[PDB]
Amino acid sequence: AXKX
Amino acid sequence: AXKX
Amino acid sequence: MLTIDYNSYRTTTPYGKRVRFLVLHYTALDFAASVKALTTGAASAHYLIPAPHDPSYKAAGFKGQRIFNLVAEEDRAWHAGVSGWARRDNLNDTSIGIEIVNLARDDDGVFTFPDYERSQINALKQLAKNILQRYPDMTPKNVVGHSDIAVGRKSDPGPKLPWKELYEAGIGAWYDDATRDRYREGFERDGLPPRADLLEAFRLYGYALPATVDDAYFASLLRAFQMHFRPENYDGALDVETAAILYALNEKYPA
Amino acid sequence: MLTIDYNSYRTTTPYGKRVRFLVLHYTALDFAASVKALTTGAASAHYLIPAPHDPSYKAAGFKGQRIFNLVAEEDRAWHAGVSGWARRDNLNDTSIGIEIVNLARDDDGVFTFPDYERSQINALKQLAKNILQRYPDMTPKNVVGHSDIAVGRKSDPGPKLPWKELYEAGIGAWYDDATRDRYREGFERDGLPPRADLLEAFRLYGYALPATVDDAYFASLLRAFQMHFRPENYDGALDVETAAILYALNEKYPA
Ligand SMILES: CO[C@@H]1O[C@H](CO)[C@@H](O[C@@H]2O[C@H](CO)[C@@H](O[C@@H]3O[C@H](CO)[C@@H](O)[C@H](O)[C@H]3NC(C)=O)[C@H](O)[C@H]2NC(C)=O)[C@H](O)[C@H]1NC(C)=O
Ligand SMILES: CO[C@@H]1O[C@H](CO)[C@@H](O[C@@H]2O[C@H](CO)[C@@H](O[C@@H]3O[C@H](CO)[C@@H](O)[C@H](O)[C@H]3NC(C)=O)[C@H](O)[C@H]2NC(C)=O)[C@H](O)[C@H]1NC(C)=O
Ligand SMILES: [Zn+2]
Ligand SMILES: [Zn+2]
């Protein structure tokens, strides 16, 4: 998983 | 004012 | 069945709030109309702030200043439109939108921007605070006018919006008179930069710009910047003052 | 001071909820490593479906299965990074993400996707159903996977993910086979559509396509599309089934  |  | 575990593990640090902008518009419609269009019309706003000296607003059965919420912050109100700011678009998704009853005018077009009732401004002032306090990614640059996001399309909230006053209440962004004068100095001697460069500056400050800019748009950009940060004049012509502000802003709010 | 009026006027038609998409991921870690990183690491997700047969999970004292909420839906979790779908981006804002524990792997860069656990899935459909029923703008194509929004820098939730099952359960989008075939045939006979049409048709489905598509990119794209809708094989290889699937969705799930 990944803010931007 | 103005969806998109 | 499966119920959910809201208590076992909770994200602390690596998450954010859903909202990070606050946008201001004027309606250009009396109250009664204003509510009509924002509750059943084809757009809406989280918060509507009426002008007590509106016959419709009194007819409505109000008297003093109120602040109405039409759409909870949690939800997505249709105020902002085809917009953009800080590398984001469709701001409507991430905005809280505030509309202020003000009988502005396009005479197809010449603009007529009536002063804002003090009352509306104090309320706005407090609301903005209230909101701002709870959305930690609403940096000062992110309190913006429609006009700033929807450049050339929208001219809300207008110049009679006392942006500076708000700044001082701790709402929105403003430049240090000092640092501006420095900038005003340079452009006076060094020369004012070329569009190309200026644009990166607006771009930087936030203005979601297009792939290309023509004189006509560039006016609108300048104009729209003017009404926010140099309402003293917003013909959209290029001033050293306008640029000085711009640069000074950017200097003061890296972001 | 002045309190807000939440009862006088409420908008009805012209407004939506903020959230639009539901995105899906595999953590790629054992549970403990996963709660840690989604609660204190550098990312997070709204919900976390553990794999009950996970030593760390059981160690932590879980009989399982459970579903864990890490960030309430109102708020913005960090799972989607750099994104794009259905004419948007930064989907972190505008989506709700679900993370399921499954130790899929990248080994420079061969891949390895374990099957999911059933309970895990029965949970998922349960949850995902609960969402969809609560966001009305989360139409079927908006139930997506990172891989689709983040092509091809990501490959979860991976091809071990029973979409079609979920479709069957009401969750997310899938084609009517009849219509698929109708295209397959048409393509075999009349040949295939130019890349132009394809990209575009890919775009229309939702995919966030760059201005200019290297076949290198294309691969990534097809791949992604495939692991979603044709996981029988997800070699980035333009097929006629694959291409037929596309228009079969674009037929049924169009603008
Ligand atoms: C009924 O709702 C209000 O009405 C209109 C929405 O149609 C809004 O006021 C006017 O909005 C338009 C753009 O929204 C602006 O005028 C023109 O905008 C178009 C954009 O397509 C441009 O082509 C024109 O260039 C521009 N006009 C020019 C150059 O003259 C006006 O700025 C605006 N009117 C004023 C006085 O500002 C209004 O905001 C809506 N309010 C609601 C729904 O509450
Ligand atoms: C702890 O964080 C988890 O870690 C895994 C990595 O083991 C995360 O997935 C990985 O995420 C990156 C981007 O964040 C993907 O991007 C790959 O990056 C390089 C950049 O040059 C490219 O060379 C690759 O092409 C690019 N794409 C691919 C397919 O590799 C990783 O690939 C991706 N790996 C997988 C299997 O998804 C994961 O998302 C994190 N999840 C957590 C903590 O929940
Ligand atoms: Zn992911
Ligand atoms: Zn407006």
Verify whether the Cβ–Cβ distance C97 to B1 is below 8 Å.
yes
CA of D222 to the centre of ligand 3 (A): 18
Q: State the distance between the two ends of chain B, measured CA to CA, in whole angstroms.
A: 11
D52 within 8 A of D117, measured Cβ to Cβ: yes
d(CA D181, CA C247): 59
Task: Say which ligand is closest to the CA of D29.
Answer: 2
Nearest CA in chain D to A4: D81
Closest CA to D15 of C43, C81, C33: C43
- Contact between D27 and A2 using a beta-carbon 8 Å cutoff: no
Q: How far apart are alpha carbons D216 and D193 in whole angstroms?
A: 19
The H or E element that residue D17 is part of is strand D15-17
Angstrom distance (rounded) from CA D222 to CA D214 = 12
Q: CATH homologous superfamily for C173-255? A: PGBD-like superfamily/PGBD (1.10.101.10)
Burial status of residue D126 (CB atoms within 10 A of its CB: 0-12, 13-18, 19 or more): middle
Residues spanned by CATH 3.40.80.10 within chain D?
Answer: 17-172
* Resolution of the experimentally solved model in angstroms: 3.1
Interchain CB distance below 8 Å, D79 and A1? yes
D191 CA: distance to closest CA in chain C (Å): 37
For ligand 1, atom 25, name the residue with the nearest CA.
Answer: C153
Binding-site positions of C for Zn(2+) read 25, 146, 156
Q: Which residues of C touch B (CB under 8 A)?
A: 25, 27, 37-38, 42-45, 78-83, 90, 92, 97, 99, 146
Q: How far is CA C198 from CA C193, C246, D31, D127, D219, in A?
A: 6, 9, 50, 49, 39
Q: How far is CA D184 from CA C54, C196, D227, D237, in A?
A: 64, 50, 19, 16
* Closest C-alpha residue for ligand 1 atom 40: B1
Residues present in chain A in total: 4
d(CA D18, CA C94): 8
Residues 21 through 50 of chain D touching chain C, CB cutoff 8 Å = 35, 38-44, 47-48
Closest CA to D102 of D159, D145, D41, D50: D50
Method by which the model was determined: X-ray
| Alpha-carbon distances, residue C102 vs C117, C177, D2, D22, D195 (angstroms) | 9, 29, 20, 39, 51
Phi-psi region of C46 (alpha: psi -120 to 50; beta: other; left: phi over 0): alpha
Instruction: Mark yes or no for CB contact B1/C90 under 8 Å.
Output: no
CA nearest to C175, candidates C199, C205, C132:
C205
Residues of C serving a catalytic function are 99
Comparing C-alpha atoms, which of D8, D1, D10 is closest to residue C123?
D1
- On the CB side of C71, CA atoms within 13 Å amount to 29
Length of chain B: 4
Contact (CB, 8 A) for D212 and D167 = no
What is the distance between the alpha carbons of residues C20 and B1, in angstroms, rounded to a whole number?
19
- Measured from the CB, is residue C83 less than 6 Å from ligand 1? no
DSSP annotation of C87: S
- Residue D219 CA to residue D93 CA, distance in Å, equals 28
Three-state SS annotation for D203-228: HHHCECCCCCCCHHHHHHHHHHHHHH
| List of chain B residues whose C-beta atoms are within 8 Å of the C-beta of residue C92 | 3-4
Task: Say if the Cβ atoms of B1 and C99 lie within 8 Å.
Answer: yes
CA angle at residue D85 from D81 to D86, to 5 degrees? Answer: 155
Residue type, D109: G
Domain(s) labelled CATH 1.10.101.10 in chain C stretch across: 173-255
Ligand closest to D79 (CA) is 3
- The answer to whether the CB of C120 falls within 8 A of the CB of C51 is yes
Distance of CA D1 to the CA centre of its chain: 46
Out of C4, C18, C94, the one facing D74 most closely (by C-beta) is C18
D17-172 CATH fold: Lysozyme-like (3.40.80)
